[PDB]
Amino acid sequence: MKKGTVKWFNAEKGYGFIQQEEGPDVFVHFTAIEADGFRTLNEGEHVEFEVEPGRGGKGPQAKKVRRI
């Protein structure tokens, strides 16, 4: 479970990318976002994300994303 700001979140498509203290971004999708209702984020805002192995194309996906 990592927490970081979001670079961009396409609500029209259902995908986004988050960047933690590490460095690189993460693969996030509406099928991973963990919220109760509106699963839309805002660029510049903080949000959590649980990077998983066989979940995202590039590998690390936001299996567990949170709004912050």
Query: Considering just the CA atoms, what is the radius of gyration of the chain in Å?
Result: 10
- Amino acid 31 reads T
This structure was determined by NMR
Query: Which residues contact residue 32 at a Cβ distance below 8 angstroms, ignoring those fewer than 6 apart?
Result: 49, 55, 61, 62, 63, 64, 65
Give the whole-angstrom CA distance, residue 57 versus residue 59.
Answer: 5
Domains of the chain: 1-68 (2.40.50.140)
Q: How far is CA 11 from the centre of its chain?
A: 12
Query: What is the spatial distance between Cα 6 and Cα 48, in angstroms, rounded to a whole number?
Result: 9
